[PDB]
Design an enzyme around this catalytic site. Structure first.
Site, PDB file in Angstrom:
ATOM      1  N   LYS A   1       0.823  -1.194   0.000  1.00 35.72           N
ATOM      2  CA  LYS A   1       0.000   0.000   0.000  1.00 35.72           C
ATOM      3  C   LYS A   1       0.866   1.256   0.000  1.00 35.72           C
ATOM      4  O   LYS A   1       1.600   1.509   0.948  1.00 35.72           O
ATOM      5  CB  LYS A   1      -0.898  -0.015   1.229  1.00 35.72           C
ATOM      6  CG  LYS A   1      -2.288   0.483   0.965  1.00 35.72           C
ATOM      7  CD  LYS A   1      -2.416   1.974   1.064  1.00 35.72           C
ATOM      8  CE  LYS A   1      -3.892   2.348   0.962  1.00 35.72           C
ATOM      9  NZ  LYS A   1      -4.177   3.757   1.337  1.00 35.72           N
TER      10      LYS A   1
ATOM     11  N   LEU B   1      -3.832 -11.576   1.022  1.00 34.22           N
ATOM     12  CA  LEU B   1      -4.952 -12.490   1.127  1.00 34.22           C
ATOM     13  C   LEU B   1      -5.518 -12.688  -0.262  1.00 34.22           C
ATOM     14  O   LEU B   1      -5.408 -11.838  -1.138  1.00 34.22           O
ATOM     15  CB  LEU B   1      -6.006 -11.992   2.128  1.00 34.22           C
ATOM     16  CG  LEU B   1      -5.643 -12.642   3.471  1.00 34.22           C
ATOM     17  CD1 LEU B   1      -4.749 -11.690   4.249  1.00 34.22           C
ATOM     18  CD2 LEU B   1      -6.883 -13.020   4.263  1.00 34.22           C
TER      19      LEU B   1
ATOM     20  N   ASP C   1     -13.868   2.372   9.101  1.00 33.05           N
ATOM     21  CA  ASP C   1     -14.359   2.310   7.724  1.00 33.05           C
ATOM     22  C   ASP C   1     -14.536   0.900   7.202  1.00 33.05           C
ATOM     23  O   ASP C   1     -14.131   0.581   6.093  1.00 33.05           O
ATOM     24  CB  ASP C   1     -13.443   3.111   6.790  1.00 33.05           C
ATOM     25  CG  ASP C   1     -14.079   3.380   5.417  1.00 33.05           C
ATOM     26  OD1 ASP C   1     -15.316   3.586   5.335  1.00 33.05           O
ATOM     27  OD2 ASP C   1     -13.333   3.395   4.413  1.00 33.05           O
TER      28      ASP C   1
ATOM     29  N   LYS D   1     -15.965  -2.166   5.362  1.00 35.25           N
ATOM     30  CA  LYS D   1     -16.754  -2.343   4.140  1.00 35.25           C
ATOM     31  C   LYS D   1     -16.305  -3.657   3.498  1.00 35.25           C
ATOM     32  O   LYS D   1     -15.163  -4.077   3.703  1.00 35.25           O
ATOM     33  CB  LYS D   1     -16.589  -1.158   3.171  1.00 35.25           C
ATOM     34  CG  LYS D   1     -15.185  -0.805   2.785  1.00 35.25           C
ATOM     35  CD  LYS D   1     -15.176   0.559   2.089  1.00 35.25           C
ATOM     36  CE  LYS D   1     -13.778   1.026   1.779  1.00 35.25           C
ATOM     37  NZ  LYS D   1     -13.817   2.455   1.345  1.00 35.25           N
ATOM     38  N   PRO D   2     -17.194  -4.327   2.731  1.00 36.37           N
ATOM     39  CA  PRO D   2     -16.842  -5.602   2.092  1.00 36.37           C
ATOM     40  C   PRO D   2     -15.497  -5.614   1.380  1.00 36.37           C
ATOM     41  O   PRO D   2     -14.766  -6.593   1.471  1.00 36.37           O
ATOM     42  CB  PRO D   2     -18.009  -5.846   1.143  1.00 36.37           C
ATOM     43  CG  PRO D   2     -19.177  -5.313   1.948  1.00 36.37           C
ATOM     44  CD  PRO D   2     -18.623  -4.013   2.517  1.00 36.37           C
TER      45      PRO D   2
ATOM     46  N   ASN E   1     -12.777  -4.186   2.112  1.00 41.44           N
ATOM     47  CA  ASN E   1     -11.612  -4.335   2.982  1.00 41.44           C
ATOM     48  C   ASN E   1     -11.695  -5.453   4.028  1.00 41.44           C
ATOM     49  O   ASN E   1     -11.037  -5.402   5.058  1.00 41.44           O
ATOM     50  CB  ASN E   1     -11.113  -2.987   3.612  1.00 41.44           C
ATOM     51  CG  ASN E   1     -12.101  -2.296   4.565  1.00 41.44           C
ATOM     52  OD1 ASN E   1     -12.838  -2.937   5.350  1.00 41.44           O
ATOM     53  ND2 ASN E   1     -12.057  -0.929   4.555  1.00 41.44           N
TER      54      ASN E   1
HETATM   55  N1  LIG Z   1      -3.271  -7.748   2.386  1.00 43.07           N
HETATM   56  C1  LIG Z   1      -4.153  -7.547   1.338  1.00 43.07           C
HETATM   57  N2  LIG Z   1      -4.446  -8.582   0.465  1.00 43.07           N
HETATM   58  C2  LIG Z   1      -5.320  -8.230  -0.460  1.00 43.07           C
HETATM   59  N3  LIG Z   1      -5.782  -9.143  -1.380  1.00 43.07           N
HETATM   60  C3  LIG Z   1      -6.690  -9.149  -2.343  1.00 43.07           C
HETATM   61  C4  LIG Z   1      -7.781  -8.201  -2.310  1.00 43.07           C
HETATM   62  C5  LIG Z   1      -8.801  -8.251  -3.276  1.00 43.07           C
HETATM   63  C6  LIG Z   1      -8.743  -9.253  -4.281  1.00 43.07           C
HETATM   64  S1  LIG Z   1     -10.049  -9.355  -5.452  1.00 43.07           S
HETATM   65  N4  LIG Z   1     -10.539  -7.762  -5.802  1.00 43.07           N
HETATM   66  O1  LIG Z   1     -11.151 -10.060  -4.789  1.00 43.07           O
HETATM   67  O2  LIG Z   1      -9.461  -9.944  -6.686  1.00 43.07           O
HETATM   68  C7  LIG Z   1      -7.662 -10.199  -4.341  1.00 43.07           C
HETATM   69  C8  LIG Z   1      -6.634 -10.149  -3.370  1.00 43.07           C
HETATM   70  S2  LIG Z   1      -5.854  -6.536  -0.354  1.00 43.07           S
HETATM   71  C9  LIG Z   1      -4.814  -6.376   1.064  1.00 43.07           C
HETATM   72  C10 LIG Z   1      -4.761  -5.081   1.787  1.00 43.07           C
HETATM   73  O3  LIG Z   1      -4.089  -5.015   2.819  1.00 43.07           O
HETATM   74  N5  LIG Z   1      -5.463  -4.041   1.274  1.00 43.07           N
HETATM   75  C11 LIG Z   1      -5.562  -2.715   1.781  1.00 43.07           C
HETATM   76  C12 LIG Z   1      -4.555  -2.122   2.625  1.00 43.07           C
HETATM   77  C13 LIG Z   1      -4.694  -0.795   3.105  1.00 43.07           C
HETATM   78  F1  LIG Z   1      -3.730  -0.267   3.902  1.00 43.07           F
HETATM   79  C14 LIG Z   1      -5.841  -0.030   2.749  1.00 43.07           C
HETATM   80  C15 LIG Z   1      -6.853  -0.606   1.910  1.00 43.07           C
HETATM   81  F2  LIG Z   1      -7.938   0.118   1.585  1.00 43.07           F
HETATM   82  C16 LIG Z   1      -6.716  -1.950   1.425  1.00 43.07           C
END
Ligand SMILES: Nc1nc(Nc2ccc(S(N)(=O)=O)cc2)sc1C(=O)Nc1cc(F)cc(F)c1
Length: 282
Positions: A33, A75, A119, A121-122, A124
């Site tokens: 991030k 994740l 905050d 929300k789905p 996050n």
């Molecule tokens: N650790 C981590 N892993 C993520 N994986 C991940 C998310 C969405 C999909 S999808 N759209 O279903 O393909 C796939 C993988 S987002 C995330 C995070 O910390 N995110 C994160 C960190 C922040 F500091 C602020 C924020 F808004 C989000």
């Protein structure tokens, strides 16, 4: 950065965009991030030592070239995507129950350490193949401030309260719980006032009886329309009475009456909770 191989952009954030990256040396895959005070710096330190199975682990914090990078464990998928993927059939109740129970454990932990998410929300809420779900993006607010989704915003925030409590996270989770159940956002407002009125049309316009002090709130107007409260049976129909009673306590108007995450974990709704495995398409 230079130590990381930006694989892809996995979304956005209220302070920066998040990328999937590989540690060009340790070969590990992470979520990076990139952020565009000092109290914030130290506050981020608190989060780094905040370790729990239902909280996304903050691995590294890099402050260089007067820029801030946060490296989080990666994740597999977010709850928004999963809900969309499950829209035809719906997420099975046992899994909805498992997810809610775990998020409450995560919140109980954060709240016991005086950490507020602010905050939820789905997008996050992150899940993995093993059935876990974890809280991500702690808004990093209170040490950071001044299209944005208002769907999960607690009424006290909408009414101008500047100092909100752990109760705002319970409200947001309640909104998410409803959405998992009905496969429809509970209060999909498109503006602060529309958000506020959608809440009022469903739960009834609050007054001093159900919310002592509400009429003295910063943004409260005597001119608000007075809507009658609707029955929960019509709000989240498929939910059994234990589920509806828990939801009603998570959505009480008065932040003081709203159930705590700890008390929620003891609710009868979780008597038969289990940890099913979701069918994830990655
Ligand atoms: N650790 C981590 N892993 C993520 N994986 C991940 C998310 C969405 C999909 S999808 N759209 O279903 O393909 C796939 C993988 S987002 C995330 C995070 O910390 N995110 C994160 C960190 C922040 F500091 C602020 C924020 F808004 C989000």
């Amino acid at each position: 950065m230079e130590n990381f191989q930006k694989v892809e952009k996995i979304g956005e954030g209220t302070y920066g965009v998040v990328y999937k990256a590989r540690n060009k040396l340790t070969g590990e895959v992470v979520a990076l991030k990139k952020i565009r005070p000092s109290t914030a710096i130290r506050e981020i330190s608190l989060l780094k030592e905040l370790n729990h199975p239902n909280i996304v682990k903050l691995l590294d914090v890099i402050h260089t070239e007067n820029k801030l990078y946060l490296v989080f464990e990666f994740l597999h998928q977010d709850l928004k995507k999963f809900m969309d993927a499950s829209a035809l059939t719906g997420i099975p109740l046992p899994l909805i129950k498992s997810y809610l129970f775990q998020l409450l454990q995560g919140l109980a932990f954060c709240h016991s350490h005086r950490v507020l998410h602010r905050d939820l929300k789905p997008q996050n809420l992150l899940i993995n193949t093993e059935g876990a779900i974890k809280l991500a993006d702690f808004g990093l607010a209170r040490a950071f401030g001044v299209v944005v989704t208002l769907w999960y915003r607690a009424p006290e925030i909408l009414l101008g309260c500047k100092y909100y409590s752990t109760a705002v996270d319970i409200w947001s989770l309640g909104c998410i719980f409803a959405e998992m159940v009905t496969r429809r956002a509970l209060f999909p407002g498109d503006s602060e006032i529309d958000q506020l009125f959608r809440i009022f049309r469903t739960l009834g316009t609050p007054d001093e009886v159900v919310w002592p002090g509400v009429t003295s709130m910063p943004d409260y107007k005597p001119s608000f329309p007075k809507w009658a409260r609707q029955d929960f049976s019509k709000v989240v129909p498929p939910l059994d009475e234990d589920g509806r009673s828990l939801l009603s306590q998570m959505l009480h108007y008065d932040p003081n009456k709203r159930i705590s995450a700890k008390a929620a974990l003891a609710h009868p709704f979780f008597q038969d909770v289990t940890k099913p495995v979701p069918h994830l398409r990655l």
